[PDB]
Write a protein that binds this DNA or RNA. Structure first.
Lengths: 83, 77, 97, 105, 95, 98, 83, 103, 96
DNA sequence: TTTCAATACATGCACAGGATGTATATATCTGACACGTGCCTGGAGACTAGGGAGTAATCCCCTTGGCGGTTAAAACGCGGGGGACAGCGCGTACGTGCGTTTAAGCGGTGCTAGAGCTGTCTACGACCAATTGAGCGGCCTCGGCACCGGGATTCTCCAGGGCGGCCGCGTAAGT
DNA sequence: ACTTACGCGGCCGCCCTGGAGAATCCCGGTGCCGAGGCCGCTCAATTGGTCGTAGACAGCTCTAGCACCGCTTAAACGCACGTACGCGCTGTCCCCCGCGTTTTAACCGCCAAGGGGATTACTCCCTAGTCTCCAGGCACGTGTCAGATATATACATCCTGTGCATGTATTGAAA
């Protein structure tokens, strides 16, 4: 079953707070939808690889090591997990 | 000549009559001419806009600008 | 009453958010979104909280970087309010397309 | 003196590093002097990072070191920022910076 | 019983106490330090193996490690590291 | 005589240079520059022509990429003529400059 | 002996042709000097590593393999030389 | 020869020797080089097809690096795979800006 | 004297003649092809070794190679490659 | 001699036509690099002994997914007004285009010796093994540190009252 | 009886004093996280043998490198002017800021069981060794695609000639 009506979770105040943190004073209109889309794209770009690692591990639960490896292969090493 | 300070409208009329062009004397050139030929200050120079507005509303100065863009002003005779 | 000019509370909130390190995106919507996206590859899968936290942190960092680059492009473009064209130019110069 | 760490005057282990180098499928013949250089450089870098973190912690009126201090020490220094340019630190944040054109006048 | 795991916390604690006698550490910082140590491990090992494969040799000695350290690090930090290796190695050779 | 407007020969030369693959930078000045820079690290060294050709090709490719990014930034900046600020912004977004 | 008066080899027509190839219509003034400087910087950023490889090869002539390795380590793999 | 048994043109013994010598693993199977050589031959045949198409479009009998550069920069898959790679003696794609055209 | 060197030109020539019977190649293109083959060699070997080290195993079989191919390549090209491996491998298994 | 429109007439504006300097195959020819052939050999191939990594069946309890009552802060919808986004006349000075004259890029030739490159001798240092044992790792613990919360304080930003430049508001003395 | 002595008159721009709310500096009593004690058992330690990779001496000849003579062509000095960059100034509509209101988030209490994780036997698949032959290592000579090119050739772009709508003057028609 494919789920829908879930991309709208990233509401307006969330992107507004993100822009406040990034240093933006005013926001337009199409940015919300565009950024959201790009976010989903990046999500896929990680999750696909994660699932592949799962298929290489002969398991059904995606552990943190697979996500760490997928993020490190893309050139974005993220610490704080230690393995 | 340049003795006492005349009215702003008279100075603007003199600056318009001093310049000659087919499209009209631009407002910036008029302001520069008044600033270079008079002893007026910054706040007194700021009165040129309102004086030109009053002269155009009265009918002494004709406007031939582009959809109200402060292009140029001419003297009606 | 008392009226405020635009930009008074904005700078204060910006200085506020530049001091704390807590999460801004809620965990349940992000988890549901991850579970939705995971169904497009293989059905019947399970996840942990550590993976969700890692994905959320990576997404927040990437979005902060993209917004910083967009703000820099908007400042260079003789403007203040950012536009989607700035984001497009940022992702074009980055090479991600 | 039985352990090589005491003979070389270091705190990091030498036998463990040698075993990892011989078991990591890097080379069939590994020397017995390279782990000394390796552990020495590791201890030097770790001591420098800990010095910077302790300086940040003492400047922030905090007795213990948090990842925020590490993030600040990495993003404020030039060498650590150049070495860790493609690395993201979790629970670190960004540097307090305000644009000049956004200030009122 | 629990499976045995390895970590690098005692050495970091000893170094911190040798530097700052009154300073602690948390768990996330310990994980960051462990990940950084593993990253340096992998990077230096890969550089050494690549140099050994390029030089058509089959033995990783000291000169290859020194060259890898001087290549991966910019400049001054590299020199300092070289000294930190050299002195300790001399102390080892006299032992 | 005959006068030409600015931009007539420019487009033709741009279309010309986008068809050939020969080198534009001369070999002797580049070789002398490489020999000068090499003396800042260690004296008494020798080089080959292959290394000089590789360095020249890499430098030309990097300069072409930087000029393309600068032209894109200048077009986005509602202008035509490129400026050093565009190069600075390009190298800042690329991450090569601090 | 340190050599000088050699950075001026990249003359105005060279940068003009480079801008024509890149797609630039008009050039300013300080770009020539700035680009030249950056070029020299990149040159050093390669040549240093090359010399280091030479010092690791116990030779006096910088071969093409050292330059290829130095360019590949920087993330800019250059083919056409098969070695 | 195993290349004739598997029906391929790339050698299998040489690839197996390189995999066993390259210090990758102590125990290497005897089926992996078949997959490897098959994928290599497929990719090489596709690249050669694209290069021959470019050469026939350019009225040239032989393939030059310009044809390879054009086939790589025009295709999406080869450009995404070779995004950080620079091709010597290749050049750029003929592109003209829209705002620079006279009106 | 001389020294014996290795190259990958006969196989490329055979593939080109099987595709385009009337098409040649130069020396720079041959060097480019050799460098590309070496790059693919190193990339796939490193991916296989990394997967073997991650899975805590000590034998590089077929599933690890297939996973490395499907990970390094995007999608469709990966699938095609998998088929190119599978069919030829079946033909090998029915041989020996 | 004056009341009103035609028209007669001089400015910017849309369209068809002409001159000239540059992109573009088209028969030719000559020169070097693409391509088929030959011979020696060290890497590729066939047959057989060995053991330990690898495949698969079984048992335990750790932990991811479900759900229910509950308090409230963050999510959601409408008002109005200051200034930010967008369209426009204009000023001079900085780049291209094409003049012309001096220079150093480029090509053919000759000679040399520094050190890259190949072959050989062998001994210091490294791989592998049996026995020992002490440094490194997992579960209890409680205690000294910071997380959460009520109150007084000095810092920074938005809005309000008074004054100067003079112009008509309209009077008395000059021509 | 009307103009300039300015008598006063009343409306826009710059300053510092003025109030209220948000950021900022000090205890209070509680909690769970850093840190010290404890004890188990596998990997680091000591030392003898045998072996093959690396340190070192020597003969080639090759490619790195220095001096030279013209040759056209790329680099360089310098007159002119037009279009792009830049400053100034007006309008309107959009996203900033405050307030009524509703819904879904985190902490929580508790019930299930699945595929994460430790134990073992035995076996088919990989390693090691001697023997042996044809794919592929590279010297060689020649010969066919395309490098250089002179004479027509059709196309792109700046320059210049020509059709057309509006304000205003002068001879005719009207007061």
């Amino acid at each position: 079953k494919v789920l829908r009506d879930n991309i709208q979770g990233i509401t307006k105040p969330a992107i507004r707070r993100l822009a406040r943190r990034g240093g933006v004073k005013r926001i337009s209109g199409l940015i919300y939808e565009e950024t959201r889309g790009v976010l989903k794209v990046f999500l896929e770009n990680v999750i696909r690889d994660a699932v592949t690692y799962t298929e290489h591990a002969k398991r059904k639960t995606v552990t943190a090591m697979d996500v760490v490896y997928a993020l490190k292969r893309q050139g974005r090493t993220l610490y704080g997990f230690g393995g | 000549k340049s003795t006492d300070h005349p009215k702003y409208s008279d100075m603007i009329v003199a600056a318009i009559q001093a310049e000659k062009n087919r499209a009209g004397s631009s407002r910036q050139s008029i302001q520069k001419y008044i600033k270079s030929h008079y002893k007026v200050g910054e706040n007194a120079d700021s009165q040129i806009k309102l004086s030109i507005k009053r002269l155009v509303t009265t009918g002494v100065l004709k406007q031939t600008k582009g959809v109200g863009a402060s292009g140029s002003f001419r003297l009606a005779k | 009453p008392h009226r405020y000019r635009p930009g008074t509370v904005a700078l204060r909130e910006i200085r506020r958010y530049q001091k704390s390190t807590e999460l801004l995106i809620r965990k349940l919507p992000f988890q549901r979104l991850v579970r939705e996206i995971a169904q497009d590859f293989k059905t019947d899968l399970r996840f942990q909280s550590s993976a969700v936290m890692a994905l959320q942190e990576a997404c927040e960092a990437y979005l902060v970087g993209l917004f910083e680059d967009t703000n820099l492009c908007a400042i260079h473009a003789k403007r203040v309010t950012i536009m989607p064209k700035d984001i497009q130019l940022a992702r074009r110069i980055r090479g991600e397309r | 003196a039985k352990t090589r760490s005491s003979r070389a005057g270091l705190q990091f282990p030498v036998g463990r590093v040698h075993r990892l180098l011989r078991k990591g499928n890097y080379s069939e013949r590994v020397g017995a002097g390279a782990p000394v250089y390796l552990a020495a450089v590791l201890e030097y870098l770790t001591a420098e990072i800990l010095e910077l973190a302790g300086n940040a912690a003492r400047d922030n009126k905090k007795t213990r070191i948090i990842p925020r201090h590490l993030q600040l020490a990495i993003r404020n220094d030039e060498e650590l920022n150049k070495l860790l340019g493609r690395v993201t630190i979790a629970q670190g944040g960004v540097l307090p910076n305000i644009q000049a054109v956004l200030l009122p006048k | 019983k629990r499976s045995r795991k390895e970590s690098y916390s005692v050495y970091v604690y000893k170094v911190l106490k040798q530097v700052h006698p009154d300073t602690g550490i948390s768990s996330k910082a310990m994980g960051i330090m462990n990940s950084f140590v593993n990253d340096i491990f992998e990077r230096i090992a890969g550089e050494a193996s690549r140099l050994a494969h390029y030089n058509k040799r089959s033995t990783i000695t000291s000169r290859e490690i020194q060259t890898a350290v001087r290549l991966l690090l910019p400049g001054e930090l590299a020199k300092h590291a070289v000294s930190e290796g050299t002195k300790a190695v001399t102390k080892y050779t006299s032992a």
